Amino acid sequence: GCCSHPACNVNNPHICG
């Protein structure tokens, strides 16, 4: 998964973070 990474939560903030 990508939503389990702080950096991936930056580019995907409200959808993935």
Curated annotation (Swiss-Prot):
The protein's name: Alpha-conotoxin OmIA
Q: What is the lineage of its organism?
A: Eukaryota, Metazoa, Spiralia, Lophotrochozoa, Mollusca
InterPro entries assigned to the protein according to its UniProt record, in alphabetical order: Conotoxin_a-typ (IPR009958), Conotoxin_a-typ_CS (IPR018072)
Chief place of localization = secreted
The reported effect of residue 10 to T is: 3.4-fold decrease in ability to inhibit alpha-7 nAChRs, and moderate decrease in ability to inhibit alpha-3-beta-4 nAChRs
Q: Which Pfam families match?
A: Toxin_8
Task: Kindly list the positions at which Glycine amide occurs in this protein.
Answer: 17
Where is the protein localized?
Secreted
